[PDB]
Amino acid sequence: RLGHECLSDTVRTNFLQLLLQEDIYSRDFFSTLLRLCNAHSDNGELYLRTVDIKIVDSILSQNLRSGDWECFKKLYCFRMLNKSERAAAEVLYQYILMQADLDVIRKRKCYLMVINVLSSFDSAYDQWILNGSKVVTLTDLRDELRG
């Protein structure tokens, strides 16, 4: 968490990729990595409550693709790239499926809980606009329940 003029002691902000190159081999930070207030989110890394935005959706993503280790930087989060309102709740579930193959767990875990966001409006308007509903364009990934 780097303030609003305390981002000049990390004027290298792509250094925060490189902190996290050797930092995580371990689960000891991921708890604070969901969009939740100061409670659950101050034990480990920064809070996604009031924080600047590069810190979020540039810094954590550029590290996220890189295989630097946790299995919980391939899986867990669902509000890690929420700093943007109901957003990467839909599409960090398929962020799983972009790194890794579509297979069993990674299939029907992520289609059952996202289809009661994306047809609990239930006529298939686009909610979080960049992938939208689960039945305009992942109706293929709702027959992959079986299999």
Binding site: F30, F72, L75, F78, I105, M113, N116, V117
Partner: peptide
Amino acid sequence: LKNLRKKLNFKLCQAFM
């Protein structure tokens, strides 16, 4: 049961895969 989503998401923590 979007609050039993919440109560499986809070053991994607480090207590279920």
